[PDB]
Write a structure and sequence with these properties.
Two copies of one chain form a homodimer.
Chain A lengths: L4 H20 L2 H5 L6 H15 L18 H4 L1 H24 L2 H22 L2
The structure holds heme C (2 copies) and nitrite ion (NO2) (4 copies).
PDB class: oxidoreductase
Keywords: nitric oxide, homodimer
Assembly: dimeric
Chain lengths: 125, 125
């Protein structure tokens, strides 16, 4: 969907920015610093679920560029492994949010965040 | 959800960028230059539906800044009118995509695009 590779760069950056907002805005809730409203969290995690699927096509074949580490494309299968792990952790977070239990939310939130970090540690400068 | 107003700016810019990609990538399909796959379009419009709801909270009270025209905040009720019109056009596009009819998609796509432009003409520099 990208006329030039730089359009893929801008897309994936914007997807990451939105994911950070929808993930990180829950930090006070998972720490107990803000109240837990199950319906609020369920709706927000649905948004995050949608967003969470978006970057990866824009890191696929022919999207070389930007400031990411080049192993995304030279080791594309390894990048996909990190993606799979992340997307599976997102499913667990959706299940926690759908269940309406703060304990499950806390655990799944940590699972997701560690998975974001694992990919960044390998591929983000 | 924004620690400082500039975080709202970056959020809404990123939401617009993603909306442009998910809207504009359908242009070849609505022109007939690319094939119409009803299921493909239905799925893409579901993504656009989610994205389409996201900018507005980040243009609300206390999000003054960026390069947008200041009437967003000085005339907030008028901005909300443009938003309502847009979101109602999105519902029509979702219905067209769900129906699987290219004629309806063409009409609703034009409706949405004109509504994007109407808001931009008033509030985007
Ligand atoms: C690999 C499978 C990734 C996973 C999982 C996540 N991110 Fe990511 N992110 C990735 C790369 C290679 C990069 C660098 C290139 C780029 O897109 O900028 C990033 C970057 C970000 C950014 C910065 C975006 C920007 O505007 O420059 C953010 C804010 C970000 N990523 C957030 C984020 C979150 C919150 C994640 C889990 C919910 C997450 N990323 C997962 C690769 C990968
Ligand atoms: C008002 C109710 C709007 C509607 C409807 C749409 N947009 Fe928008 N957009 C709006 C403003 C005030 C601005 C300027 C400030 C900013 O967010 O940048 C924009 C900007 C954009 C951008 C540029 C984003 C960037 O990175 O700077 C894009 C690509 C964009 N808008 C796209 C877009 C599309 C495709 C819309 C309909 C599907 C649409 N916008 C509606 C305000 C409003
Ligand atoms: O910005 N994450 O692709
Ligand atoms: O996808 N596997 O780490
Ligand atoms: O960028 N649209 O808020
Ligand atoms: O929302 N009315 O133009």
């Amino acid at each position: 969907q990208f006329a030039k590779p730089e359009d893929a760069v801008k897309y994936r950056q914007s997807a990451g920015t939105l994911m950070a907002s929808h993930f990180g805005r829950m930090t006070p809730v998972v720490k107990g610093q803000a109240p837990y409203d199950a319906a609020q969290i369920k709706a927000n995690v649905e948004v995050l679920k949608t967003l969470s699927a978006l970057p990866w096509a824009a890191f696929g074949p022919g999207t070389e560029g930007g400031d990411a580490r080049p192993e995304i494309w030279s080791d594309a299968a390894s990048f996909k492994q990190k993606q799979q792990a992340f997307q599976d952790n997102i499913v667990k977070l959706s299940a926690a949010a759908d269940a309406g239990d703060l304990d499950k939310l806390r655990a799944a939130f940590g699972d997701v965040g560690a998975s974001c970090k694992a990919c960044h540690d390998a591929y983000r400068k």
